[PDB]
């Protein structure tokens, strides 16, 4: 039904499911148009690319869209199979492997923007007893607020399945000190309805 | 100019009964079903316009509502003002529309002729 019910992201998005994932033109179309909407969402200055933390890029199709317009990015991912699939696509941006909930391991005042592509609705549930969802979301949000330049822009694409998940993510974001809100793409629609966390420092 | 291997000069002489083979299926069936009298009166008006006009320029225009009339091979040299819903579109009868109707030269509908939010706070 949904990919979140299948299991952990490290093990569900394996070799064969990534292999059938990259051969899906519908996925290509939706990913390119959501990447275009995300790039239009943040108010970055024109003729000057920004330093974007691309979390949840995976195959790097959004990263490919970033590299097509001359922008630069670094990718953070959790599954090595679709990471190798992204590597096989002669991609330009760099790739990192690790859990985003354990903390973003970069210096503060570094990133001028943050692009999250289908990675924040993943972490609301727990697949291990040692993982606390509230603690994981709070640590991820606090580390993201630390590594961001003061005044940078962060956009997070998501498809929540109920209002309580949105309540927990918004209360974690507003307890982490992020300033911003929520932008919905066609809220009264069903196919075209997307959700977009927009955040900034101050 | 020739039509189905038949020139216009013999097309004028070639008569009503053996019009069947040089046409398509639809107007062949239409002629087999019996032609009416209103388009005969339209033919009479067209030819009455054709007689007394001087023969060194194009004769006077004949206007009608009839969009679904079979163009005869002897129509070459007429001006048809066919209705469309509002006006009369008046058109020259070239020799090349023997197999066509009057409806496709009188179009009843006009062609159709059919920015993003940025958050600041």
């Amino acid at each position: 039904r949904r990919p979140e019910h299948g299991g952990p992201p490290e093990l569900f998005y394996d070799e064969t499911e990534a292999r059938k994932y990259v051969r899906n033109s519908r996925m290509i179309d939706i990913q390119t148009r959501m990447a275009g909407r995300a790039l239009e969402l943040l108010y970055l200055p024109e003729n000057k690319p920004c330093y974007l933390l691309d979390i949840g890029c995976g195959t790097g199709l959004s990263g490919s869209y970033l590299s097509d317009e001359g922008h630069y990015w670094v990718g953070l991912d959790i599954s090595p199979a679709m990471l190798d699939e992204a590597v096989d696509r002669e991609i330009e941006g760099d790739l990192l492997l690790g859990d985003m909930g354990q903390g973003i391991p970069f210096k503060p005042g570094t990133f001028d923007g943050c692009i999250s592509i289908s990675a924040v609705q993943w972490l609301c549930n727990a697949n291990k007893k040692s993982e606390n969802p509230a603690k994981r979301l709070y640590c991820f949000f606090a580390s993201l607020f630390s590594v961001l330049v003061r005044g940078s822009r962060a956009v997070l694409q998501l498809y929540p399945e109920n209002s309580e998940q949105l309540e927990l993510i918004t209360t974690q974001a507003t307890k982490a000190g992020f300033s911003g809100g929520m932008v919905v793409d066609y809220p009264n629609s069903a196919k075209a309805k997307k959700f977009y966390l927009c955040l900034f420092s101050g | 100019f020739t039509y189905r291997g038949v020139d216009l000069d013999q097309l004028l002489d070639m008569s009503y009964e053996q019009l069947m083979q040089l046409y398509s299926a639809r107007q062949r069936r239409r002629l087999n079903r019996g032609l009416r009298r209103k388009q005969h009166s339209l033919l009479k008006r067209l030819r009455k316009a054709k007689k007394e006009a001087p023969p060194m320029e194009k004769p006077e225009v004949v206007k009608t509502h009839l969009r679904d009339m079979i163009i005869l091979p002897e129509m070459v040299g007429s001006m048809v003002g066919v209705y469309n819903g509002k006006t009369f579109n008046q058109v020259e009868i070239k020799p090349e529309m023997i197999g066509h109707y009057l409806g496709e030269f009188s179009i009843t509908y006009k062609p159709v002729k059919h920015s993003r939010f940025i958050p600041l706070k």
Binding site: T174, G181, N188 | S115, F117
Partner: peptide, 29 residues
């Protein structure tokens, strides 16, 4: 919550010309 963009005669999201493409913005706390 997008009440100005909801069609009265239909279920969906109707466009407006004076305003940009349909959306709904709500703030955080």
């Amino acid at each position: 919550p997008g009440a100005e963009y909801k069609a009265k005669k239909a279920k969906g999201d109707v466009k407006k010309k004076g305003r940009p493409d349909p959306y709904a913005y709500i703030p955080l706390n």
